[PDB]
Design a protein around this nucleic acid. Structure first.
Lengths: 192, 144, 64
RNA sequence: GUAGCGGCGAGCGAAACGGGAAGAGCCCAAACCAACGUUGGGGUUGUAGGACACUCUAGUUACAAAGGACGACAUUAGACGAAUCAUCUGGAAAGAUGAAUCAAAGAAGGUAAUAAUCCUGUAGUCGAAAAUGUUGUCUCUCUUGAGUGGAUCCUGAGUACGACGGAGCACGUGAAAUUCCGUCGGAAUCUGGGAGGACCAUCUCCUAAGGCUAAAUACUCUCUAGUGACCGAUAGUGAACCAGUACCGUGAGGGAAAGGUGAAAAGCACCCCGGAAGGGGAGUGAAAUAGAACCUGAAACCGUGUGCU
RNA sequence: AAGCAGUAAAUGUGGAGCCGUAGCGAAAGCGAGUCUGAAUAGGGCGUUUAGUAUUUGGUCGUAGACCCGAAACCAGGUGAU
RNA sequence: GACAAUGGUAGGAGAGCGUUCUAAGGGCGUUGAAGCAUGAUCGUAAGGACAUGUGGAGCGCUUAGAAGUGAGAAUGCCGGUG
């Protein structure tokens, strides 16, 4: 019926940038919030256990040294961040490649608008069964559809995103893609 | 697919860990040697020098000074002006927009390196002797 | 943090086009009656930092 | 990590411009006016303001003046809230084989084992005697709104500034401007005074020597609700056990080790050896070498019997 | 880049800023040529005139910087049972 | 196929084994998981399986990512036992 420009959904995927984007998104979801205690942080251990020489024993300075039991940890984990950035032109390629990979395997179908009047999970289950969709599916909307979002949010393997906020991880994770024509046009226009 | 991920070939390398047995090659001394200043934890000498004889940057004299009122000009060559079509006006307001001058420091200076082969009019702060005739050789005029 | 630059070295050399360093000459401060005429003429021409010394003080001048 | 400072060595190290968050400005001393130096009015500045003479009309209780009365949300207890039945193994079913249902509820915890439909819950909605916060619509308490002329007068004094000895400005007295302290000298009054990195002249900008002011900023002993490619009993707070406890020192002070029966105590009625501890039966339990010195139970080390020597 | 929006979410906006496209000279300054020099006469440095953003690995600098070990110094307190 | 090379301290370069956690996919388990003991098994090495006893509830496999990632010595620290 309708035809989309081949700049999107019609290009050879680039696996290097896709892998880099997937790694970037996975690393940006990670918070450290991990720490240990070094020699100075542990309580006590100011004096010297015994004199330097005079008895037959190893020379020691504190009771909180790493070789002791209960002393501080040297070179442990420290709180930090793992996020990093990538040039803007390379982010656009990482999304078009994912969409093209989705469309090559016949995993993109276009439907009309969702005129839901009440949030009903059973109705969404039936319409999914009619469309013959797999267990994992991603559906986009032109804006935030409150009625569509309230439903389909308790069925395992079903997630909803907007036209603007398309993710790289979500497209790769999903098994099938269902898009409305208005949202498809918005994606074709706004996205390069 | 999230369960078959392959990074680009030749783009990842495993790091090196020292002090992990003798079969690795960096087991006991961890690539340091035996019984020196450089074999201790805390470094060696300063990057310049430490102790010893006089450093090189101590046996040479200082030269010159710097000017507080120094002016620097952004240079545009004749060959870079071939982008604009013939018989058009060129202004410092247009060179910046067209992408020729990214940073106008104190003005625009036209240097005659290349060949014009055009019929355009250009105005700028300063002109070189070579760039003056080349603009007027094939026609046109320049204004300061 | 940011790496600091040897201020004393920045007052004695200048960077050339190909990344080399241009330096001045020594032994020209005083005591000019103990040197030949040919010596003093040839001590007024600038030189270049040798490759042996370059390997040692390359990190000192990194913002220059 | 630029300009600079620096036994110009080690090293120290800026600001203006530009892009953003946030963003309201006012009150006093003097000239003048009437009492007995006092209290009221007037007046606050650089495109120079005001007193004086001239025709001259938004309560801001976070500064700008200080005490109270008017209904809506939010905390400090809670209440409703959809959906499952069979067979096999087993001590026990939530597991497997089959057939159903709910979902704005497939977060989590507990149930004799691994549960969307067994329980406490979750999504959603409702509920407040009484106390405490925020807010907004009337009360209440103050309130003189505009420009031309400049005779004369007022606009912060032991102050600004200088010398001597110090300190601080990125700047080590150096050609050191800009600003603070101690000692000693010590100015001018809009044709006035200060600054533009010694200093002088010309231009430009500003108006010290009196006092208040929310927001963007920094931090967590605590109160509620959450998360982690953080630890899992030599680890994680020193402390998962009634730990700053035992214990050590005259004192300031130092500072530990110790978690686990089983689903349910159902914690062995009764018989035999003793003085007792302990053991052998019987019994409870799926299991008692799971018997409270109790989940598994490695090594060092200590004993008994055996094939070859 | 900071900031704004967004789930502490990875994505849009944000062009102050930075690097490169042209060097030489202490500087005024000149410019594919500049400095020295009376004089490209010679000589020095340039005319390669393709970089730039992110990231894996190697090394260096500032931070304790591969780990354990002093005789000592300074500051504030406790002691004449 | 034909030839040539392969002793090694300091040190430089490359390919690999194993442990803990995470994402995705796919599996095992009261008809018995991890752990523990034995065996006459497999690969060029670090190492990997299978069977039998004990054990009573969790654990591997593939591709990627991260690191508190490997122990015989320091008159090392703590506990047990000669």
């Amino acid at each position: 019926s309708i035809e989309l420009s081949d700049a999107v959904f019609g290009i050879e995927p680039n696996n290097s940038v896709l892998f880099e984007a997937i790694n970037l998104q996975r690393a940006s979801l990670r918070q450290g919030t991990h720490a240990v205690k070094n020699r100075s942080a542990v309580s006590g251990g100011g004096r010297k256990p015994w004199k330097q020489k005079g008895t037959g024993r190893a020379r020691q300075g504190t009771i909180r040294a790493p070789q002791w039991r209960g002393g501080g940890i040297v070179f442990g984990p420290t709180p930090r961040s793992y996020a990093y950035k990538m040039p803007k032109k390379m982010r656009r390629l990482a999304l078009r490649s994912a969409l093209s990979f989705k469309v090559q395997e016949n995993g993109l179908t276009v439907v009309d608008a969702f005129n839901f009047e009440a949030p009903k999970t059973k109705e969404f289950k039936n319409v999914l069964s009619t469309l013959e969709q797999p267990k994992k599916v991603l559906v986009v909307t032109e804006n935030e559809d409150v009625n569509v979002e309230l439903s389909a949010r308790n069925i395992p393997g079903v997630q909803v995103t907007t036209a603007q906020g398309l993710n790289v991880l979500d497209i790769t994770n999903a098994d099938s893609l269902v898009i409305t024509e208005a949202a498809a046009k918005k994606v074709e226009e706004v996205l390069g | 697919k999230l369960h078959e991920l392959k990074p680009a070939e030749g783009s990842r390398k495993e790091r090196n860990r020292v002090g992990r047995g003798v079969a690795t090659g960096n087991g006991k001394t961890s690539g340091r040697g035996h019984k020196g200043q450089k074999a201790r934890s805390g470094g060696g000498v300063r990057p310049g020098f430490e102790g010893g004889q006089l450093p090189l940057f101590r046996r040479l004299p200082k030269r010159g000074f710097t000017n507080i009122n120094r002016k620097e000009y952004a240079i545009v060559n004749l060959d870079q002006l071939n982008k604009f079509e013939d018989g058009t006006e060129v202004t410092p307001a247009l060179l910046v927009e067209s992408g020729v001058v990214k940073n106008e420091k104190s003005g625009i200076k036209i240097l005659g390196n290349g060949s014009l082969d055009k019929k355009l009019t250009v105005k700028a702060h300063k002109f070189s002797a070579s760039a003056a005739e080349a603009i007027d050789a094939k026609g046109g005029a320049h204004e300061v | 943090p940011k790496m600091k630059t040897h201020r004393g070295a920045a007052k004695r050399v200048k960077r050339t086009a190909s990344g080399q360093l241009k330096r001045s000459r020594a032994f020209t401060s005083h005591l000019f009656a103990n040197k030949s005429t040919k010596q003093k003429r040839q001590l007024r021409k600038a030189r270049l930092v040798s490759k042996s010394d370059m390997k040692r003080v390359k990190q000192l001048l990194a913002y220059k």
